[model samples]
Target chain A: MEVHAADQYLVAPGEADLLEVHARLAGTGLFPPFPPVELPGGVGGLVARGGFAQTFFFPAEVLGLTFRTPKGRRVRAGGVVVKNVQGYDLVRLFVGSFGLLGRAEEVVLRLRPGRAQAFLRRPFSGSFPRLVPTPRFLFALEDEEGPWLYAYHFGHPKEVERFREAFGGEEARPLDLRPRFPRGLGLGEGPLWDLRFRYQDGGASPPPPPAFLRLARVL
Target chain B: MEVHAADQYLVAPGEADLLEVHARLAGTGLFPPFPPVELPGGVGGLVARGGFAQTFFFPAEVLGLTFRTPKGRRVRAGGVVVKNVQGYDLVRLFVGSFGLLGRAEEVVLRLRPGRAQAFLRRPFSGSFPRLVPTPRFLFALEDEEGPWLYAYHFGHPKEVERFREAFGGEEARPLDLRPRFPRGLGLGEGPLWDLRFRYQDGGASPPPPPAFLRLARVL
Candidate 1:
């Protein structure tokens, strides 16, 4: 979840946008527990997102490590790690462990001169569920009779207006986006977006009314 | 294979031993083709020693066209063309195409400065089959029913003798190993190594002669 390099970037600005997009796509609010956040201009963001506990950068040429188990089996990893010959391969094993292998320790990575920032626009469009393991540039249309379209902007400021125009008009502001809740739900206009958008619908039940009224409500 | 660089080195003789060792390792009659041979000696003296096609020296940087196939479910091969990418991908599609996707044409490689040659030792105790893919190491008991041991030599001359001494004993030789055909199989001995050392040992044979016919046949 922590990206480090000479490049300066941040992911907090898009947290609300990502949560809304994921909830609509999955149809269930509980899906994708972590907020989506891009890293370093969205190039090499870790696909595991909140699952990462720590990351280390090695400043050596070659690294090697012996695995607890024999490495003859096919290694299916989705990330990259480079290291020097400083006697450890803990990084490679950890890059795609999916939490199966034991915790990795003492990784040495190879470093080189960082490149200057460059941008290029090439026509690219494809389904996300098939192209990559992560859910980026992805959305699903629900058949629950609600609005079927939602626009998400993951790139620079230049793209947000484009998406808004394409999806119809600009989306309503944060406070006006909340829908009416069920009667007797005890929900109220508390930073409207905070109450409605902070969590998925039907997640909790009005704090059980009152402990004394719980018997009356059930009976 | 056409070895553009090592052949140059062999013709010039600045490092004859290194070229010889390259020839020995790349030759089909010696070892099984495992991976692309990387010579650090700046693309000179890479002499082609076998009957199959061509060889070339590829520098670390630079993208070379190894092979390409039609993008589809069945993945039909299209052609082999050199690529000009920066990263070196060992799991190239074209290199393993086996002429199914055409053959390697031009390659762009990065050159480095260094000198080292590969060599094999003699007087080993293992029995190699009559055919070999390249001049590589093998491990087998003199008798098929005996113990399992491995026999291999290092690519560098200095390392080969030392390696041989460490793993039993064998005198080193400047052998010119070439691919061979066994039992008239026209695979040209290259596929034995090209196809990951897989052997296809089945074929139709002429009918056996009758005993009476053999005995009565005129001299």
Candidate 2:
């Protein structure tokens, strides 16, 4: 299972029970499904739909997973761990794709296991002049100061209150946001898991400012 | 000496009489030595003080003159006839450098009886929507409603006007803003004539808008 300590996720093997795992974490009140439950359902359905099958007759016992490439170059296939025998895998397909198009991978999940611990943190906002090296296309929001900048990372729950007390209460509060996987996922292929999984779980879309649009268009 | 018709310059072999040549061009009002003076003096002084010799060279010659590259490449050196070469010739250097960077092997100058005709068309001003395709680092001013677009070319004066007209401009006028070669006495390996001459007459500077800065800094 590929687990992320920050997002509090246990990406378990296929046979694991998602509902059972969710039940255990339900007591913490940190919804196992996080910001949106619809996304997981969508991803699950996509995985169930079978595609071309390449069955092997070999009766060899393989306990561990070994990642390989389409060209059979097996030294390293990113950070994704793939089992030897498989008809298809959601893990390989989901990791890389920054989910603009479709659902990412399908893996049994285990929610964070612990008591319901709440933390509040304040966001910092300010204005800084940006020197455009080149003439950038002006979009709708050309009048704004500039693109908004946010720094987000997950740590121990105790750190959140410290952040809020130091920063103050007038600033923006952390919100639930959904993850966006990259198109055609894999290790190093998609948006960083922390970015997609922890931070923007249910945040509002950016104002589509000119500077932001330019940055997005470039990427 | 080699000369070109469009620019009306003569490429002569050996040092030219800069004062006499200035007097002759002053008669035509085309080759204005100084901005304020109707007939500027100090042609020889400008060349001499401008460090023409230390930085450049202009070998004395007469008749059709064409310079070639170190690798024996030919430069199509031809120009309009503009009377006797009685002074330091600035037209040759102007045309050479104006034609982008290259080696000048031979120049056939066409001298006329006297002064020719000259005039200005008009001035224009307008704004365009963000319709032109934005280049990577460069920005282009163009008419959004026109059939053709404005394209900046290093050489080819006609193309600039043609592009402007296609973008709805009624007329296109050639505009040259390059600084004149400083006046000075001709001497040593690096004369103003040599520096300007090579730049114009035979050699070229490294192209501008350094590609290295673009690669390293630009995204």
Candidate 3:
């Protein structure tokens, strides 16, 4: 991946490393809105499909994309700037088209600058109640056996104070959740996350295949 | 547009009146991220193209869309929930495809609850300096003659206090800007607004035609 700007960058379609990218961006005090990829090419599909819990807070959205159309040659859409006042949003058109449109050859994603907060997680206190609105940075994860509710509140100190009323989880780190990302579970609905990550292994559901493979298969 | 939920709704392509829709949404105490449409068929194009200055702050983005495909069938994508942990983002695909893909049969947009803000405007002081990022709520408008910088900050007391340091302009009404909507001009970049509104009538650039017509042409 190459940095196009402080907040935007160009990546070689699914070949980039999510953790390394996070570290590089962190080195410059920046962060992407989507979660870190446990496997290769995770962030790519996430951006294209537009599902991630972090999007509920930071707008780490896909800024632009160069697509390799069926006709060959790459047609670019969207722009790197935050206020891209360009013509037709050709970029979004290709984003979630699920390859029926084209493939994102050169993807440019916008990252966040910084946030003041902490990550916390607690046991899966019951069904985590779906449908009710949630604080922007909250999450619910599950394995067939165990599940946990997580929160990574990023805001002013005062705002964080309010989040604490419900985000009653122990402080945790990014890696704590990375290991279970592929299939452990994601419970937030509505704007939704990638469905692959939503496959909750709630028992004799059988061992699912790799998420990276299925996400591409869905595409 | 009919209300699907407190935060989301389904609009009839560009046929819906911008202000009317806003009023209906406002009645429910919710608001969209895009600006009010001055001419017919405004917001539809805006959502598809993914532009508009207001998106800088509000998460009033598109949630789902049912497209009338080339084969004359409607295909729905995306969803209404804030954490839509679903499947492919086909919604974005049809959003900015001009008319090459299909028409948005049903447009489901997400709206914000409420914010503490006051619309304020001041004379365009210098170039409003592009390149350097400004506060989220700031905007610049230009016409063949006059120009003004505008801001509609939605935040708490402390944040509003900080923004006041620079947003020292006369409080204005939303209607004050409506008359000049068609071609007054918009000046935010990066994530961008629709290009139709970006055309600057800085001189005898000939009174540009209606933005509605041109946007469809581009589609």
Candidate 4:
């Protein structure tokens, strides 16, 4: 029954629009209950809108994803339930897109129950041991220095305690960390590139190219 | 180093091509481990090429998804990491399209360790309670009669036992169930339609129109 405004959009897409729609479902008792992620601006905006966490948690929740193509055509894809092998998955195509192929106009998201308890934790070092039992959600952050992990453990109180013990770190509150390329690194003011490559079996990090400064390894 | 041909496609896209590419990574010791799904014909071919189980398990493993659009232009999207908010997710768009959006030419899939143990289970009746300590994968099938659930549990032997006890069902062997509309239903000879819709809060099933006979409900 609870709803919140997610992120900033080019148009004034806000609570009013959500409320207008939410009003229709008032009597039905089926209100969108999934809490919006507290990320804003740049890639974070996309994350907040519907990033990996959102997608991973509620892949089928997206009933419809509407986009306006460059040719001034509005294309809608996906629907309630994901048995839709009928056509290409245009919904996923449009979600993370930063307005390249088209702009996402509306996204109909199915709702789910919220996590019983949610908190964040920072790992001690860049390398952390693989926990015996995986947590509900884990996102790792890395820079030239090392890796900092952000974990969200969702379950019963006992299970949550086990998760905390596994990480062995004090609870770290969510800071206003906007999503963007980490600054102050020696990386120049040229094009910012995020390179993703797998290390060979037992292979070490490859040497960085001359024009580029390796910032982080997101494992 | 193990490899298997998956699904069907134009040309002999098989061992020779795979070996040529596999030869390049000889010393790396990182052979493609993900097993392709066994599907062929219609949309099943797409699913067989990359089955739902594979897609669900390895969503981010796909680094790049290349497709040849109807216009004969090759469009590539996504990158090494799944955090690409740069543009539309053309990768997902092309994967399950059944050659509607475009023909998927090359799909760069990242490899991961295989599951320790995996098996399927079919619930005895049409109804199953939500299990505690969820299984690795749970997919439910429903028809006008009721719901039939097929679950794939992937984990340690002990954990898998726990999952089995939670579901309390007889193991169901994988059948040659290709992806297609159900046949032999009394619906008669006409255009087959797969309608996906959710019931309103506390809503009952509306009467089926004279032209259509309800098939199943997938919840």
Candidate 5:
């Protein structure tokens, strides 16, 4: 792992798994926003997700990537600095196109100086009150025990306090986030309906959001 | 202007310019990370910046957009929820493609809850410094009068204080950021040389960041 910039790291995608990358960063005081839940593929898979975790990827997020060209030479896209707008958006183009165009076997990632977080747990339910300042992550799960809810927030202690008061679940106490979800159901940051009815739901997959999403209110 | 989510806004891209979208966002005590710089294009132009200000756009940043499709249908990509990976990344795809794919005449932006900022100005020079937690934006410019440097940062008052202490620009005093640049040379978030030196010096445009960017060090 090389520190290209204060918040950026350079890693060979083919060499390290996402877990290795995340763990290496954790060695320092930094973190990727969300864990790579689907660990099947490595950094290459994450890159293939196209816009996966793009929200917290980097200022230039995936600042630089080296793709395999026909002659085995790597033509790169993006630079160290975030202000990148060269020929075309090749960075994003490869992200979704996967290796059809080319594969980025090497990459540089800009990460955040790790955030302080609070994870609160409570018995799960369906009702979701409109949260004033939304929690960073919210998840609900049902297992042998029963239904349960999980909420996670990121901020300093003071901000966490305010978040706690907003949700106002006096009984919900703090717990740590386990990388392994209960039962490995492959869902994160969602309501608890997954374990039970995910397969049976009429909405086999989440349908697209409406063009005028406000129109969704009546639906 | 309304707080769509904690930091999101729904605006008519056709009705407002980027400045208006930014100003309306400001009214609610929230701020977009970067200003809607190019006033000429209005919101349309910024939207057209491809990934313009995308780093700070919104989670569903431009979460939902109403784009004019063929046959008078307006299709929207993205949604109130941020964890969207439906089909391909239409939001970003449209961002760079502009109206060729579809025109986003309406959009929802996720703005941050504003930040305390510190702007420090000083006489300019050619050298660059290696500072930690890189300043949000840095610009250097030359004029008939002389050369100057401008640095802007976004953080809480405390983070701002730390940022100020880092640069030790004791001679530089805090100043407000004016929307218009000193000479209106059509540059923002860049070094000062754009006015005079940009056309003359660049070796004709910034050649792309390197295939092996580390190799750039010796160049």
Candidate 6:
């Protein structure tokens, strides 16, 4: 692996441009999983689940983000990976960190195998299965309409069948469904919010919060 | 949700006693996964997959490890979770940091719901499937003999069945297998080494290093 100096290059912060870089590396059969979608504001908007997973697998040490300290000094927190124990793991502190720490100009990502077979299921109802039965589905997505689930399974023919059977949902055309945002909403807009929580073990769902009914009553 | 002051208390570094701390927290259902085996030298010998994964999920602002700089100054690199961007992520720099940066005396961890059903497969054979067919399996272990895959699935009965069928492995008594280090190997003794790597997508495994055959020839 080649180690580039921190000042060596710049990546234009545009969705198309960044994806173009993604495509170029992917062509070599070496790239991490693709960002789930074209992030709207380049790396800055790369804040959701897909982005977080991508960063989780990113192998490099020096992250692209750089910050200016309050004392008018630019301090780069991350650096090349060395066996030395003298330094700190500054990369993680910044990756999920919204720009409160600094501005991220460009990112260098560690690549992994990027091939997968996609399977789609559509026009479905009923609560989606809480447990996903396969890790072969490199990337899985659920439509907001509660009608479709898309899974991209990677591996042999038999393996794919095993995943499809285990998941046990109606198969549909990939083009039949795509993730949709509200009609007038852009990537980061409106009163929209994202919440993350783990479901408790067993069928014992937590009691509904008191505020939920109040919000329902107001709505 | 309580924010304890960084200066509130300190946990002394002793092996059997520290695990006593582990047992205490585990009783509260609020501890990270336990070390796979009791570390021989106590905490220091707790190295390998279990330790690595535990560190991966540990969420805290101030880790307990403190180090003396070569210049004779005691530096407390980690601290309380502050939203401010002024500080380096010194905590991460120390978590998995095997005592090189500093001596970690105590640690504070984030708590999560911990409940799971386990399954054990005994007297098995064949290379274990790389793409585990289920995310419901919270933890999976495969023995060095290429048999006996142990999986800890964390969901409902139906969910577990869905995983078992996809993987197509027989279920056996959980006590039939447990990870064991060689006799006299101890925890941190010998020239033993552990390595973790990702399998490539498709069947194209990476080429083996030339030194691999040389080592084999010597052995």
DockQ, per model, reads 0.02, 0.01, 0.20, 0.21, 0.12, 0.08
Per-candidate TM-score, first chain only? 0.26, 0.29, 0.63, 0.51, 0.55, 0.49
User: How big an interface RMSD has model 5?
Assistant: 15.1
**Candidate 2 local lDDT, B1-219, one digit each (tens):** 333335655444323334344345544423321111111113322221221211111211122334433344443222334332111122222221212223333343333322322211222233222312211111111123332222222113354344334344333232221222233212222211221222221223323222112211211
Ranking by lDDT: 3, 5, 4, 6, 2, 1
lDDT by residue (tens digit), candidate 3, B1-219? 677554345454654656667666654645566544343245554454444555252223677666665557556666655423343345544554444445566677766554444566777755453322234445566544566776655445456566656667787755434344454333323111222434331211212112222223222
lDDT of 1 by residue, A125-178 (tens): 222123211111222222244322222333333453444344443332212122
Off by over 4 Å in 5: A1-10, A13-38, A47-61, A64-87, A93-219, B1-7, B10-15, B18-27, B36-39, B50-61, B64-75, B82-87, B94-104, B115-120, B127-136, B152-219
Better of 4 and 6 by lDDT: 4
What are the RMSD figures for all models against the true structure? 23.5, 28.1, 8.1, 12.7, 9.9, 15.6
Model 5, B20-97: lDDT tens digits are 665566546565544434333455434544433222322234555556753456666656555453323445544544
So what's the TM-score on candidate 1? 0.26
Candidate 5 lDDT, A157-178, residue by residue in tens:
6777777887765444332223
DockQ of candidate 5 (2 decimals):
0.12
Candidate 6: where are CA atoms >4 Å away?
A: A1-18, A31-36, A44-80, A83-87, A119-128, A135-161, A164-219, B1-219
The lDDT leader among the candidates is: 3
How displaced is residue B156 in candidate 5, in Å?
4.5
In candidate 2, which residue ranges exceed 4 Å CA deviation? A1-24, A28-82, A85-93, A98-105, A109-157, A170-219, B1-219
- lDDT, candidate 3, at B47: 53
TM-score for the A chain of candidate 4:
0.51
Report the TM-score of chain B alone for all candidates: 0.34, 0.23, 0.63, 0.49, 0.58, 0.46
lDDT of 2 by residue, A120-177 (tens): 2222233322312210101010113432323221224554444434433233333211
Q: Candidate 6 clashing pairs?
A: A31-A112, A32-A112, A89-B93, A133-B133, A134-B133, B65-B104
Best by DockQ: 4
lDDT of 6 at B215: 18
lDDT of 4 by residue, A38-124 (tens): 323322124223442221433344545555555576665655434333334555544544344345555656543322444565643
